[PDB]
Design a protein around this nucleic acid. Structure first.
Lengths: 141, 130, 176, 36
RNA sequence: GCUGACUGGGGCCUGUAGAGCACUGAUAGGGCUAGGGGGCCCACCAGCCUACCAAACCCUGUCAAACUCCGAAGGGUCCCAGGUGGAGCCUGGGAGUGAGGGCGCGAGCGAUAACGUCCGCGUCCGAGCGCGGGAACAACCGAGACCGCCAGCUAAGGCCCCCAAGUCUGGGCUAAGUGGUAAAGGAUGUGGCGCCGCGAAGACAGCCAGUCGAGUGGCGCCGCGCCGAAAAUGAUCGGGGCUUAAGCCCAGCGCCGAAGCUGCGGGUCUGG
RNA sequence: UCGCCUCCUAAAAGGUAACGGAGGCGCCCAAAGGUCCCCUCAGGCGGGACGGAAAUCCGCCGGAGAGCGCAAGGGUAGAAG
RNA sequence: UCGAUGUCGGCUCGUCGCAUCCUGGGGCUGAAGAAGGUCCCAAGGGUUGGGCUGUUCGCCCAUUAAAGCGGCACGCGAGCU
């Protein structure tokens, strides 16, 4: 659905979400971004759903850039079971997202179509989003 | 108010030098109106006639542009009209008062008429242009 | 392109930021100084000048230094500039980016495809007294198949290609 | 009608706060919304 | 018999936080491109093309407990100083404990559920269900209760009445009883900062566009509020009752307030 | 599942739990031991009768990614090979 | 709570909640009328008699304006079964 082709390890620890984004925080490809305003795990099913809506909107139209990738496995014990007996089974995958991450990006489109498309996607995401342009995001010399 | 720059040079440079104009009053034109007097009405005076009320709305300030002192008598109105800053016109004076008599119902009334240093008043253009 | 700069002594950057100022520094082989500028005025400028065009900084001693930007650090959250790096030029040849003119539109239209400005600008060696405004491209027959990369450019006097030069610059690619 | 997202549905429609509550009224009554 | 905890200066030791992609893998977009699929098309085996699968290489973007080119704060240790403490070290007699609990921080498990569960550092309850605050309430805030006082100063928290002390002062917000505990998401609810459209080329809204004669629209930051909000005995912010407040934000002065601290008497144990 | 070894979890000394993540051991070598003396890898690109895509041969490029009986980590060619 | 908190369902007795099955208001309707659909306000009052199973529930018969869904230690055994 959207997952690595291999992993070194099959299951991995949950961990935490310190602030910031580290990187992936400025535009770089297309001409309009959808940015994160809160940390979260975003699931492949959500990414996909949003992405499809984007296209569906400007049907077969411009270009799309999916900038988060679900590498993290998501475990979950069988239903109704009690505790212990090792870690759970892997159900899906998530992408760790932290405020200021530019998750999507678009090119070859009107601002009207874009503005809208993204909004739509922001709905499919379980976090708050903002739209962006191409400011002083040009880390050059 | 950025728009006054391409305008405050042409109601004392255009509205100041001419030769032969007069006043009509196209008023309540219903569905019979689009923008065809800025798209075919030049046939009255060659490269000349048009459709505008430019400086025909603050005409107390346009009756101070070609120097005309004492300003309160006519000037404003739905002054549709058409003459030109370099164009001829004379023989339509008998045909004139036929568009307010019965071809319309009243609406071809006038107000001024600058006959090259000869402005005609109301009945002074209605008796003159006859 | 001019900006009133000021001289920063040792006032906590935080407080300057808090007060709508933008902390920063200026440097070159010879000078190194803590400065600050005002935000909204800098942005007004940078929004156009950016790193492509010179800015002249007006210090509190009346002097007016010709500078380029080398860095805009920003707070990921509240995506705003935290701090500006200014490089004051002189005469020795200095490297920088120069903007391009994507003329017209590419011919890849039937398959839904869309242009990719992979390089809006290119790295070049130039003297501070021979800085160009722009560079002129030639896009027209850029179809869904082929692209262009290297020194396929109209290099004027004062310029030296400081790239590969074999490197992709703009490619038309399929739709989403 | 009674939804937590009331929006404008058309350009004849109109958003009206009355008596604590956000309504909407169009010319055509299918467009009539009240927030709840 | 000064060596203790803790502290200062020096010297080693370290691979986390953060960051990074040089290794190990994962990974987006583009270029180039070994093979392979497949179209052109033939067995003379070549040959051309591919908005297909796909090594390395290049450009631009990322991810990682069992990755690290890099790496703090801190931590451990030795030396030399301070440090007389219900400190330390040594030899022996007597034990009880070997069932922990909550809170904060850092991880694992769990479903980024549990008054969950497992470790780590800290703290308290345990044994401080003695004292003040929190309506009530082991472990949240204050504070370590030898005895006495119809004395005084403070702590947290408080000063409209219950209820001790301000219906104290100066400036704002808010009109929901919000305050008096809920989200995505919605809105011409309010207020305060911003920056542009564009207005005697006088349509922003209203009747034929002339009259009409001005302010109109669009974003972006910030505060307070509105709906989103349905559960079972009688309700309620602790209660009365609070609206330029008795709510909220920002300033300041004074008071109240514990078994904390002082004063005065007394007791006991240690050392002198 | 029960002893032993490697890694992570383990919060940069040591140590650190869970029916947490993930692997190995219960052997082996008379040379795979002692010392002395020599020698330097894996790849990659050419080039060469039988010869694959690494048989053996030649030449460049190649600080280590080879190898060190066996799991992992550490270490290591200025050798432990 | 193990030095005892009787542990399904039935009956009897109720009382509460509204997320309403009737009945009273109402707005949309792909509302001609009649009859629906859907949402909004509203428990005051009502919400049947049987066959089958210990059953809860369910299916079925005949009706009905309707044949609501829950809480009260899966309400109620010092009240019965």
């Amino acid at each position: 659905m959207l997952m690595p082709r291999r992993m070194k390890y099959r299951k991995q620890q949950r961990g935490r979400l310190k602030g910031a984004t580290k990187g992936g925080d400025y535009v770089a490809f297309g001409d309009y971004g959808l940015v994160a305003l809160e940390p979260a795990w975003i699931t492949a099913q959500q990414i996909e759903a949003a992405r499809v809506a984007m296209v569906r909107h400007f049907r077969r139209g411009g270009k799309i850039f999916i900038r988060i990738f679900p590498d993290k496995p998501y475990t979950k014990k069988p239903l109704e079971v009690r505790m212990g007996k090792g870690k759970g089974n892997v159900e899906g995958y998530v992408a760790v997202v932290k405020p200021g991450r530019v998750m999507f990006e678009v090119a070859g489109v009107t601002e009207e179509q874009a503005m809208e498309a993204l909004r739509i996607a922001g709905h499919k995401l379980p976090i708050k989003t903002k739209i962006v342009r191409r400011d002083a995001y040009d880390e050059a010399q | 108010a950025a728009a006054a720059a391409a305008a405050a040079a042409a109601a004392a440079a255009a509205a100041a030098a001419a030769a032969a104009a007069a006043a009509a009053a196209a008023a309540a034109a219903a569905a019979a109106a689009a923008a065809a007097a800025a798209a075919a009405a030049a046939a009255a005076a060659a490269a000349a006639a048009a459709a505008a009320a430019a400086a025909a709305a603050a005409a107390a300030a346009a009756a101070a542009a070609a120097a005309a002192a004492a300003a309160a008598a006519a000037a404003a109105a739905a002054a549709a009209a058409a003459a030109a800053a370099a164009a001829a016109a004379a023989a339509a004076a008998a045909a004139a008062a036929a568009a307010a008599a019965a071809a319309a119902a009243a609406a071809a009334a006038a107000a001024a008429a600058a006959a090259a240093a000869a402005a005609a008043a109301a009945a002074a253009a209605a008796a003159a242009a006859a | 392109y001019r900006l009133k700069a000021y001289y920063r002594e040792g006032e906590k950057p935080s407080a300057l930021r808090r007060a709508g100022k933008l902390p920063g520094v200026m440097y070159n082989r010879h000078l190194n100084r803590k400065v600050y500028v005002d935000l909204v005025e800098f942005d007004k400028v940078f929004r156009q000048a950016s790193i492509h065009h010179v800015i002249v900084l007006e210090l509190p001693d009346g002097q007016s230094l010709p500078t380029l930007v080398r860095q805009v650090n920003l707070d990921k959250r509240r995506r705003r500039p935290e701090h500006v790096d200014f490089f004051v030029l002189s005469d020795e040849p200095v490297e920088m980016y120069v903007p391009l003119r994507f003329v017209g539109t590419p011919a890849g239209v039937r398959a839904g495809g869309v242009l990719q400005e992979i390089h809006r600008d290119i790295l070049v060696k130039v003297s501070p007294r021979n800085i160009p405004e722009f560079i002129e491209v030639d896009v027209s027959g850029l179809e869904i198949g082929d692209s262009l990369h290297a020194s396929d450019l109209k290099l004027p006097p004062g310029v030296e290609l400081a790239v590969s030069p074999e490197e992709t610059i703009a490619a038309v690619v399929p739709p989403e | 009608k009674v939804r937590a997202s009331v929006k404008r549905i058309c350009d004849k429609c109109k958003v009206i706060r009355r008596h604590g509550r956000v309504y909407v009224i169009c010319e055509n009554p299918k467009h009539k919304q009240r927030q709840g």
